[PDB]
Design a protein around this ligand. Structure first.
Ligand SMILES: NC(=O)c1ccc[n+]([C@@H]2O[C@H](COP(=O)([O-])OP(=O)(O)OC[C@H]3O[C@@H](n4cnc5c(N)ncnc54)[C@H](OP(=O)(O)O)[C@@H]3O)[C@@H](O)[C@H]2O)c1
Ligand SMILES: O=C(O)Cc1nn(Cc2nc3cc(C(F)(F)F)ccc3s2)c(=O)c2nccnc12
Ligand SMILES: O=C(O)Cc1nn(Cc2nc3cc(C(F)(F)F)ccc3s2)c(=O)c2nccnc12
Length: 315
């Protein structure tokens, strides 16, 4: 279905527009186009450095009466340099001010790893490594919880958490709110079966990020495997008279995951939305699952030493 029910009673659109790497100068138009096309979910983050320009778009479409605020699902994310309890609210309000909203539909802990607070998104020490902060997930969660009580955000969740980190929150003594969502990298080369099964079992909705394999991530190398150019996936696409992107978007949807493909390109924003009028076969789904290779595009490998580095566990 086009929306999934969250554990807070809200309906989250299963298709949203990603905005990482969307430059300030193109993201306003992208969001306006997406909304015109019918997207009702935008995935944002402070660290994407474009929330102002996302805000401008939403304001215009509200003013044009193309959409109402309550038909939109806006997500943002608390960056790693703000995990200190006392900094969480300020970060949230700064995001709200930039987006020009009164509330977020969903606010996530962007990554489990706290970094040193300050002006830099990735504060480096003299060795050129990221500097951790003395912060922990449960205290950051407590501060996220307070945002709900204040009505700044309708829902809270986590992103890039492994199952033990999730369990830690679920088992917190005095827990006020379970995570609504865990947003994780997910595509045919990283199919995430075990963490998906775990989260779904707990009533936590999974959002699949980098569904097209993030070919525009700054660090892509030419030898890196490429989902959009995989001939196996094109053949499945051709069979439905759809594009490879459309298949890659449809795939998570049929696993009951939310998916958030990024484009600044109007024609592709439009293409990516045309995923409600076809269906992958159960054989197609099996096949796409068989392509897993535990290939991960977002992993900041030098953070392996951080106590909260998520990707040591099997899931
Ligand atoms: N929670 C997290 O830690 C996290 C991590 C990564 C991503 N995310 C979220 O997930 C979103 C999506 O992931 P992503 O941005 O890494 O990458 P992605 O959506 O897998 O891929 C985006 C890339 O695919 C291209 N593209 C889009 N539609 C296409 C189509 N129909 N045909 C061909 N190329 C197409 C885009 O080109 P153009 O823009 O040039 O059209 C862009 O280079 C992000 O933007 C962000 O919102 C979250
Ligand atoms: O490490 C590489 O060679 C490229 C690469 N980069 N990145 C992004 C970043 N990598 C870094 C690395 C540093 C640091 F300076 F090494 F600490 C500081 C900030 C960042 S942001 C990944 O997340 C990433 N994840 C998986 C694989 N490669 C990468
Ligand atoms: O975080 C996102 O939503 C996408 C994104 N990913 N990456 C790769 C990253 N990978 C990681 C990995 C960790 C980890 F928790 F240590 F594993 C912590 C922070 C990061 S950031 C960037 O370097 C990055 N840099 C700027 C903006 N966005 C990103």
């Amino acid at each position: 279905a086009s929306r999934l029910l969250l554990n807070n009673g809200a309906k989250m659109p299963i298709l949203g527009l990603g905005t990482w790497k969307s430059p300030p100068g193109q993201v306003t138009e992208a969001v306006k186009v997406a909304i015109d096309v019918g997207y009702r979910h935008i995935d944002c983050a402070h660290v994407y450095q474009n929330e102002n320009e996302v805000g401008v778009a939403i304001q215009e479409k509200l003013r044009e009466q193309v959409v109402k605020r309550e038909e939109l699902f806006i997500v943002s994310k608390l960056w790693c340099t703000y995990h200190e309890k006392g900094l969480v609210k300020g970060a949230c309000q700064k995001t709200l001010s930039d987006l020009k909203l009164d509330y977020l539909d969903l606010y996530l802990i962007h990554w489990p790893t706290g970094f040193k607070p300050g002006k830099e998104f990735f504060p480096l020490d003299e060795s050129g490594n990221v500097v951790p902060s003395d912060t922990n997930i449960l205290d950051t969660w407590a501060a996220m919880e307070e945002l709900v009580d204040e009505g700044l955000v309708k829902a809270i969740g986590i992103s890039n958490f492994n199952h033990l980190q999730v369990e830690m929150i679920l088992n917190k003594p005095g827990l006020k709110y379970k995570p609504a969502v865990n947003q994780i990298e997910c595509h045919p080369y990283l199919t995430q079966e075990k963490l998906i099964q775990y989260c779904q079992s707990k009533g936590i909705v999974v959002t699949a990020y980098s569904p097209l394999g993030s070919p525009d991530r700054p660090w892509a190398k030419p030898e890196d495997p490429s989902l959009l150019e995989d001939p196996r996936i094109k053949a499945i696409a051709a069979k439905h008279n759809k594009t490879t992107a459309q298949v890659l978007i449809r795939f998570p949807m049929q696993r009951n995951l939310v998916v958030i493909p990024k484009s600044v390109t109007p024609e592709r924003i439009a293409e990516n939305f045309k995923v409600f009028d076809f269906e992958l076969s159960s054989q197609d789904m099996t096949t796409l699952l068989s392509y897993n290779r535990n290939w991960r595009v977002c992993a900041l490998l030098s953070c392996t030493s951080h106590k909260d580095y998520p990707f040591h566990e099997e899931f």
